[PDB]
Design an enzyme around this catalytic site. Structure first.
Site, PDB file in Angstrom:
ATOM      1  N   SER B 143      -9.462  23.162 104.818  1.00 16.94           N
ATOM      2  CA  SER B 143      -9.034  21.864 105.313  1.00 16.94           C
ATOM      3  C   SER B 143      -9.531  21.756 106.730  1.00 16.94           C
ATOM      4  O   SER B 143      -9.670  22.767 107.407  1.00 16.94           O
ATOM      5  CB  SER B 143      -7.502  21.791 105.297  1.00 16.94           C
ATOM      6  OG  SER B 143      -7.031  20.690 106.048  1.00 16.94           O
ATOM      7  N   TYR B 157       0.857  24.171 106.167  1.00 15.24           N
ATOM      8  CA  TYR B 157      -0.350  23.860 105.425  1.00 15.24           C
ATOM      9  C   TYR B 157      -1.560  24.372 106.179  1.00 15.24           C
ATOM     10  O   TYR B 157      -2.414  25.047 105.592  1.00 15.24           O
ATOM     11  CB  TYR B 157      -0.466  22.361 105.207  1.00 15.24           C
ATOM     12  CG  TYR B 157      -1.717  21.916 104.491  1.00 15.24           C
ATOM     13  CD1 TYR B 157      -1.814  21.984 103.104  1.00 15.24           C
ATOM     14  CD2 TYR B 157      -2.805  21.394 105.211  1.00 15.24           C
ATOM     15  CE1 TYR B 157      -2.971  21.573 102.446  1.00 15.24           C
ATOM     16  CE2 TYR B 157      -3.951  20.950 104.577  1.00 15.24           C
ATOM     17  CZ  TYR B 157      -4.041  21.035 103.198  1.00 15.24           C
ATOM     18  OH  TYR B 157      -5.190  20.602 102.569  1.00 15.24           O
ATOM     19  N   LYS B 161      -4.463  27.287 104.843  1.00 18.12           N
ATOM     20  CA  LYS B 161      -5.902  27.126 104.768  1.00 18.12           C
ATOM     21  C   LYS B 161      -6.647  27.946 105.816  1.00 18.12           C
ATOM     22  O   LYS B 161      -7.829  28.228 105.639  1.00 18.12           O
ATOM     23  CB  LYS B 161      -6.284  25.638 104.888  1.00 18.12           C
ATOM     24  CG  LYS B 161      -5.688  24.752 103.797  1.00 18.12           C
ATOM     25  CD  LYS B 161      -5.831  25.350 102.406  1.00 18.12           C
ATOM     26  CE  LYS B 161      -5.530  24.315 101.321  1.00 18.12           C
ATOM     27  NZ  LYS B 161      -6.659  23.367 101.132  1.00 18.12           N
ATOM     28  N   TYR B 202      -0.192  11.608 109.323  1.00 21.46           N
ATOM     29  CA  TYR B 202      -1.353  11.818 110.218  1.00 21.46           C
ATOM     30  C   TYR B 202      -1.522  10.774 111.313  1.00 21.46           C
ATOM     31  O   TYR B 202      -2.406  10.924 112.160  1.00 21.46           O
ATOM     32  CB  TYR B 202      -2.653  11.881 109.404  1.00 21.46           C
ATOM     33  CG  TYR B 202      -2.743  13.090 108.540  1.00 21.46           C
ATOM     34  CD1 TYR B 202      -2.275  13.056 107.237  1.00 21.46           C
ATOM     35  CD2 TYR B 202      -3.283  14.267 109.015  1.00 21.46           C
ATOM     36  CE1 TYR B 202      -2.350  14.161 106.415  1.00 21.46           C
ATOM     37  CE2 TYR B 202      -3.358  15.390 108.203  1.00 21.46           C
ATOM     38  CZ  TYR B 202      -2.887  15.331 106.895  1.00 21.46           C
ATOM     39  OH  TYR B 202      -2.954  16.434 106.061  1.00 21.46           O
TER      40      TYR B 202
END
Ligand SMILES: NC(=O)c1ccc[n+]([C@@H]2O[C@H](COP(=O)([O-])OP(=O)(O)OC[C@H]3O[C@@H](n4cnc5c(N)ncnc54)[C@H](OP(=O)(O)O)[C@@H]3O)[C@@H](O)[C@H]2O)c1
Ligand SMILES: NC(=O)c1ccc[n+]([C@@H]2O[C@H](COP(=O)([O-])OP(=O)(O)OC[C@H]3O[C@@H](n4cnc5c(N)ncnc54)[C@H](OP(=O)(O)O)[C@@H]3O)[C@@H](O)[C@H]2O)c1
Ligand SMILES: COc1ccc(-c2coc3cc(O)cc(O)c3c2=O)cc1
Lengths: 260, 260
Positions: B143, B157, B161, B202
């Site tokens: 990501s 998260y 990643k 976001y």
């Protein structure tokens, strides 16, 4: 107040009975902090560290807790605050190393390594944020093998610490609401019990050298021609957790004496 | 034999019933590969993908497997090889996203995310190495939030990643003994079901913009002023898994149209 000191502060270091953690613990005490010395197995070593900290004029307590068990991490932190009244500094240091070709790595070995190195560190962070006084400090431990150094058969460990690099950058955003800075130190070859575990893997044809020779070879990986020591990582953690380190935040500092 | 095509090759893509994985699976088919379309829940969508791949003149099979269960990953790969005879390409795409302030992240949520995003990808890699023919290709999915993009309440998260970034660099060393290259693609905002779910995290004040508006705002993050699409990731994976991508090995390619 003096430059870089921690007088009046209370710190906690996971796995500080021996290795890097022990050097960090004693050093935080030397800088004036009261220290919670966490261990999982090394009772006798933990008590030596406590004594050293008392001898240098500060105070400390040894508390047993398996950092793989989140409920024990909660309890560890509650006991810290209950004993000393408050908590300013949390160094997450506990870790284990692993080696194996991808093809042979098992579920159990993945879990053994990640439960402590990544999961455990994550929830040490979480409990640190919850219990820390405003303006406090959190430091996790990564590795030079996360980004800077690529070693065959080291995928599991390298990954376990790669997650920590990412964690600390985002932890800094969340932890900012209590003005707590969050960083990680990423040591290279540092002479401890773990060093012997991994030295023949970190060196080119390592199996065919003596342990003494390997250490010398690892020394020559730095352009300063010496090995990294626990005090080296201690020195840096001590700066990061001080007033003066505040502007270093959300960063991973690789401590390999310039090997990278 | 045409430059960049996969004629005669067999590829497997985890979670290719929908989203990025679906676009990858169809595109590997378009390049001439036979494709194993893995899913966990989206049976109907998985079969649509299979059909599309057949309609464009290649062959494909849908196989259910929960990538959180290592024994199911083993079985997934055995079924792949049993159906098509051999396996050349493995794209590890399955993943879930998560958001939460460090202080509120639970054991279960950590486990939910890491079991698939990190652990699952690790063992997809392991089974890929074991089953792949020599000269094959492994691609994992990271990501842009692992390194390049820092979002509040996204620590779990991002870390999940970040481990994948480290994995692939070291996987390349181990996988070299079968001449298998290993890379990851690190997409940014790519318009899929996951995109819409979480686009409001976001963006500052995201809850008070429409889904449409949020997408347009994410479009303007790239200096190309458009969103990323599944086909964009598919385009790159298709190059990496080809003959011509061989010299890209052990790398993580961030695919955000220049946002970073
Ligand atoms: N040494 C190196 O060259 C090197 C290089 C890169 C990164 N690192 C990282 O640096 C950190 C410290 O390593 P080290 O060199 O001090 O390793 P070490 O010499 O093996 O000591 C590791 C420490 O981890 C503790 N520990 C192990 N399992 C635990 C558990 N379940 N709960 C709580 N604590 C536990 C140990 O205490 P107990 O005896 O009580 O278990 C010990 O204090 C690790 O996180 C490691 O990944 C080290
Ligand atoms: N879209 C983005 O902006 C973006 C950005 C960065 C990274 N990514 C990464 O790209 C990958 C896919 O993203 P996406 O946008 O396509 O997400 P998505 O629309 O939610 O698609 C997710 C896919 O993963 C599969 N999956 C979920 N749980 C699974 C399990 N337990 N076992 C096997 N497969 C499972 C789903 O299949 P079922 O429906 O059959 O469960 C589905 O095919 C993920 O690894 C994600 O982290 C996406
Ligand atoms: C105007 O600024 C911005 C900046 C970022 C976004 C954005 C919105 O939703 C997302 C959803 C995802 O799943 C993954 C992503 O990576 C993003 C973004 O990057 C939207 C607008």
């Amino acid at each position: 107040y003096i430059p870089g000191r921690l007088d009046g502060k209370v710190a906690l270091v996971t796995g500080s009975g021996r290795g890097i953690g022990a050097a960090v613990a004693v050093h935080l005490g030397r800088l004036g902090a009261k220290v919670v010395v966490n261990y999982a197995n090394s009772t006798k070593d933990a008590e030596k560290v406590v004594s050293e900290i008392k001898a240098l004029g500060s105070d400390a307590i040894a508390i047993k807790a398996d950092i793989r068990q989140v409920p024990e991490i909660v309890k560890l932190f509650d006991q810290a605050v209950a004993h000393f009244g408050h908590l300013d500094i949390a160094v997450s240091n506990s870790g284990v190393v692993s080696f194996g070709h991808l093809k042979d790595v098992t579920e159990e070995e993945f879990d053994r390594v990640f439960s402590l190195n990544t999961r455990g560190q994550f929830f040490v962070a979480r409990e640190a944020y919850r219990h820390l006084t405003e303006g406090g400090r959190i430091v996790l431990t990564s590795s030079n093998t996360s980004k800077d150094f690529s070693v065959p058969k080291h995928s599991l460990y390298s990954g376990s610490k790669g997650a920590v690099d990412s964690f600390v950058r985002i932890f800094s955003k969340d932890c900012g609401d209590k003005k707590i800075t969050v960083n990680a130190v990423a040591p290279g070859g540092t002479v401890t019990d773990m060093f012997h575990e991994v030295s023949h893997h970190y060196i080119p044809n390592g199996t065919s050298y003596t342990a003494e020779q390997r250490q010398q070879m690892a020394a020559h990986a730095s352009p300063l021609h010496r090995n990294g020591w626990p005090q080296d990582v201690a020195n840096v953690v001590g700066f990061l957790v001080s007033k003066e380190g505040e502007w270093v935040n959300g960063k991973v500092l690789t401590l390999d004496g310039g090997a990278a």
